[PDB]
């Protein structure tokens, strides 16, 4: 547990085998041009993030499984399951960068902006997603958890798509629909676009690999992880406006794209009539000066301190909710996840 | 069998239930804005094609299953399985139209060109694909064929992505790689981008729903269906240059996008040095006059008559190969598929 350097190195050591499995490395193919290119798609887009979701899968398994069952082989299976989550993440971010007209991801150009990619990034998005099911078939097809694991990936993929769609409906006729930027809409967006795939998916996979199918245990885990998910996406929204791109690895676009971000929702709650006028005039505009005006309003409204205090109070509340978790569910699993993301700058 | 009007009407009657299943029609949702929009995504993009692949799934089942097992309920399951193939087709075409910068699909604007879609079509592509697995879980999760069916969809999706990628690598530095436009490259492209999902997938699904898992029966079916698939994509390539858009429902882009089409490959085989120079100068150019010059060369080289004769000879050869099919595999299934596509103008 505790997302150590050793934990990261054991997880990273699996990645080259995932690439070999999906590119027929060492095996005859009639289409080597595609398998060689797909190696570069995977190497660019999959392994250079924080790997929070992959590592969370392994830590969940290690803390849920009986100690006597934690063989090197079973721990490797959990790591492979973690990489399947990272393949879903990689696919989502390729598509998300196209939709958000983003510049940088993980400190390199967004994949769609690279030479001879463009709209081919759409196919690469689909290709990376489809590839996780090939890995699942190879290593898990013989196990009782196989169908539960596949059905969970299918369901989380569908839910994430619904979330990406609601996120995108922030604008119509080139202006943001500020009247609809409520905390209710915000909670709905982040539940579907982030919480299911980021927190619910890793822990539920850990439970399934340990042959834990109890509906009440899954429901209790889900309740806490959907709260953690909302908290995580609020942190992401703060990073978009106030993050250092040299640390976050990405340049923010939420203001220009007119997104229903936490900062936008809270700005509208805290705004006097004049400040509301500034949002209505300058939010979701292409002009750099319009973005700077909105950032200046965010600073004037004290959004940095408001976020800082919200993050501390939300951390305390989630810790209270974790204390209420029963069954055999280890509290320390949820505490470790929270400790890993709390007050993050990336 | 025989793709009758009655067959089409029975298949079409299932579609509204597929839409209701994927949009929580009659059920409470916290995100009605997305479920209502997704109804319009499905209604626009899924049901207005020829439905050859969906209908082929039903006809395969009806000709492989024991007559006493062809209850209305089992025939409905085959139709639902057919609609899962049509969801995969719908997803592929949304993405393919973005990548091919196409104007029209099924006699209406390409989905990405509609108001307030754009790059959101990428998400809609992913959403429509993920949705077929929800339908599979609802109606088939209790059946022996469930895992075989899921694994076949996963494998065919991955293969189709590899094919879309090879298709896209026709150009580098804005010029087509005419030296690589060989019949060998062509056969590889169409095997992956068309044959698996168009012909192999429907018949293999029909076999699985009839609990036919014999590896040799699947291999024999695959051999004929990969031949039919290549034949079908050659017909598609002819339609791109010489089709009537009022009949095909789509405007061709292969010449402008510099595609390794059958017409391009055969043009290069049949071209004298001067005619080769015309391809090298005018193939894969944005200027309308460049496209017209290539179409004029195609007419001069007699590509219409060359295609017409190829189609007749290929039909005869495939019919010979079908005669060689053994086991209990019904020859009439493969004959019906060929009769449905032979000399098509759409
Ligand atoms: C060279 C640099 C500065 C790289 C930045 C790496 C980084 C902090 C990525 C976040 O993980 P992710 O990409 O998986 O995203 P998420 O925040 O959604 O977990
Ligand atoms: C109003 C008009 C003219 C509509 C055209 C309909 C049509 C012939 C679609 C082909 O089916 P499809 O879209 O499923 O494609 P494919 O050729 O790949 O089967
Ligand atoms: O803000 P987004 O939702 O676009 C983002 O968090 C990615 N994402 C997409 C869905 N869930 C998360 P990112 O800031 O990484 O570009
Ligand atoms: O020619 P394409 O491969 O792009 C096509 O056939 C679609 N497609 C994509 C993959 N297989 C078939 P369409 O002419 O319908 O645009
Ligand atoms: Mg983004
Ligand atoms: Mg986004
Ligand atoms: Mg963000
Ligand atoms: Mg096309
Ligand atoms: Mg295409
Ligand atoms: Mg075509």
Numbering used by the authors:
A (entry chain A), B (entry chain A): 84 to 429
Publication text:
Here we characterize a metal-dependent, bifunctional isoprenyl diphosphate synthase from the leaf beetle Phaedon cochleariae by structural and functional analyses. Isoprenyl diphosphate synthase in P. cochleariae (PcIDS1, EC 2.5.1.1) produces FPP in the presence of Mg2+, but preferably forms GPP when exposed to the heavy metal ions (HMIs) Co2+ or Mn2+. Inter- and intramolecular cooperative effects in the homodimer strongly depend on the provided metal ions and regulate the biosynthetic flux of terpene precursors to either biological defence or physiological development. Strikingly, a unique chain length determination domain adapts to form geranyl or farnesyl pyrophosphate by altering enzyme symmetry and ligand affinity between both subunits.
However, GPP still binds to the HAl site by inverting its PP moiety and exposing the prenyl unit towards the protein surface.
